[PDB]
Design a protein around this ligand. Structure first.
Ligand SMILES: *[C@@H]1O[C@H](CO)[C@@H](O)[C@H](O)[C@H]1NC(C)=O
Ligand SMILES: *[C@@H]1O[C@H](CO)[C@@H](O)[C@H](O)[C@H]1NC(C)=O
Ligand SMILES: [Zn+2]
Ligand SMILES: [Zn+2]
Lengths: 236, 236
């Protein structure tokens, strides 16, 4: 079983899957982590510029333990450095936790530079009592019925990020420097996580969960601290 | 940080918390596991007798990363061996997965014999689109507003298991022999998991999630297979 979440294919043994995954197991700045709201840094106001232009239907694919939209119109400007949008995707349950609390879902918008430096913009989802939703993501999730098998793809509706955008702009942004949450867990990723969760509906949550199944990396040691697999490796 | 889920206090380093936790790290039959519905054994019909008599309000306590009801009126008879009820409690997200799919919540009813042999009866929860609930668990969850702090306790309403009972009786029961999902992860636990998830409401899920935060052990290697920490233990 290749790049999985289960057993021998899962995070505890990604390094054993291919030596190119050293970071996964030896990294001292691995992601996800448990964010301590009263301890992280918050992106300073006006240090972060997120551009997400209206897009036409785009490739939504069943990764197999994953659900990803491919989209290349978008940017994130962190002070002087500009990253351009590669794709966005979903995890269920969330990968990060806040004050130890997890969430039913997390979105990752992945950006890069020509130097292949990476930055992420993430959002947390929280089930809405009142049935509220994010039309953007409704639009994204609409076609899921078309891609039940891993390795198949389809096309979303028009993606309008107006709402997402100014949600991101109206709220704080947890910021830290970590890694990819998938192999090879490359470090030096710039993490930017909106502090305020988006509405999610039961219908949507179940729809997605059934496709993705489970695709979250367990949380890591604190930043700088030994990868907590190397910690476990003493013994013996 | 003592018996946690976060970093140094979490499952990857429980053994390092106290030598009495060897199984956590060296066990070949650790729980939870990913259940493969077309591969596990189903409890044979009439091999399992679950008795849950009506109960008065009982001690609901905030474990800290846990929510547990203490109750001693109940039994589970597995052929000729009778286990008596110690307590039941909740995990969010679920700890087990079915065909790799996780669930927002799992309940554990823990039973024992005088030989301190253990058996569990577990139920999966799935968010109900239509707002449906299990009155039993509604009754259990009612008082949560009283126990925000870890180490505090309160008292449930009357607990009537009529519904739960015959749900358990009307459905299959995944069965396998594993371990405790908490230290010291003692092995030889008799696992019995109802195949059919209970209704859960957004209101309830969020209420609980905020109290428990996150309290699920990552899934283990297959049964008999090396604990997948010992697997990770090559090298350094
Ligand atoms: C990306 O931008 C270009 C330039 O405006 C445009 O031609 C194209 O439609 C955009 N891509 C999508 C899929 O919206
Ligand atoms: C347990 O059983 C005893 C005897 O039936 C009964 O008096 C008592 O109410 C029960 N405990 C609770 C809290 O329901
Ligand atoms: Zn991701
Ligand atoms: Zn449990």
């Amino acid at each position: 079983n290749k790049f999985n979440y289960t057993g021998l294919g899962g995070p505890l043994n990604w390094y054993g899957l291919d030596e190119a995954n050293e970071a996964c197991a030896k990294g001292k700045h691995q992601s996800p982590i448990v964010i301590d709201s009263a301890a992280i840094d918050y992106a300073a106001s006006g240090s972060l510029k997120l551009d997400l232009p209206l897009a036409d239907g785009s490739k939504l694919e069943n990764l197999g333990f994953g659900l990803q939209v491919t989209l290349t119109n978008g940017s994130l400007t962190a002070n002087s450095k500009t990253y351009t949008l590669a794709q966005f995707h979903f995890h269920t349950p969330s990968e990060h936790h806040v004050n130890e609390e997890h969430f039913p879902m997390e979105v990752h918008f992945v950006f890069q530079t020509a130097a292949k430096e990476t930055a992420v913009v993430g959002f947390f989802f929280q089930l809405s009592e009142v049935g509220d939703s994010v039309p953007l993501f409704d639009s994204v999730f609409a076609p899921i019925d078309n891609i039940p098998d891993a390795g198949t793809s389809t096309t979303t509706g028009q993606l309008d990020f107006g709402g997402l955008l100014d949600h991101f702009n109206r709220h704080g942004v947890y910021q830290y420097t970590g890694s990819l949450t998938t192999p090879p867990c490359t470090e030096e990723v710039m993490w930017n996580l909106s502090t305020e969760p988006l509405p999610l509906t039961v219908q949507g949550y179940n729809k997605v969960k059934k496709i993705i199944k489970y695709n979250a990396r367990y949380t890591q040691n604190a930043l700088g601290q030994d990868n907590l697999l190397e910690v476990a490796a003493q013994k013996l």
